[PDB]
Amino acid sequence: SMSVKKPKRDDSKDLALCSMILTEMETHEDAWPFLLPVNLKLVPGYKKVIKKPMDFSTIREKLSSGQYPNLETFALDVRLVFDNCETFNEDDSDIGRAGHNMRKYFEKKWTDTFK
């Protein structure tokens, strides 16, 4: 509360480390469904159903331009990519499987780097 603070967690490396995690996600073989924004002209249903589209390129731009205030807002956008994928794709599809794999991969790197 006022004039009463928990000890300062060092956050000075967070930007660099989120950038490393994102690089690893970008270079995974199963990243291909997530590298670019879904083309809303060419994919029926996407625009109406997926209220907040997110992809890796868009995360990378946000990251590089100071649009994440902290490491939790970065993790929210990454999870959004996988939650959108589950909303629109069958579990038993190549894209559906890709999204499960990528989410598992991300969650391990996140825990190992920060928890």
Curated annotation (Swiss-Prot):
Expressing tissues: Expressed at varying levels in several tissues, whereas a smaller transcript was expressed specifically in testis.
Domain Bromo: 9-113
Cellular compartment(s): Nucleus
Function: Regulatory subunit of the ATP-dependent BRF-1 and BRF-5 ISWI chromatin remodeling complexes, which form ordered nucleosome arrays on chromatin and facilitate access to DNA during DNA-templated processes such as DNA replication, transcription, and repair. Both complexes regulate the spacing of nucleosomes along the chromatin and have the ability to slide mononucleosomes to the center of a DNA template. The BRF-1 ISWI chromatin remodeling complex has a lower ATP hydrolysis rate than the BRF-5 ISWI chromatin remodeling complex.
Subunit structure as annotated in this protein's UniProt entry: Component of the BRF-1 ISWI chromatin remodeling complex, at least composed of SMARCA1 and BAZ2B, which regulates the spacing of histone octamers on the DNA template to facilitate access to DNA. Within the BRF-1 ISWI chromatin remodeling complex interacts with SMARCA1; the interaction is direct. Component of the BRF-5 ISWI chromatin remodeling complex, at least composed of SMARCA5/SNF2H and BAZ2B, which regulates the spacing of histone octamers on the DNA template to facilitate access to DNA.
Entry's family note: Belongs to the WAL family.
Record protein name field: Bromodomain adjacent to zinc finger domain protein 2B
Protein source organism: Homo sapiens (Human)
Gene: BAZ2B
Full-protein residues shown: 2054 to 2166 of 2168
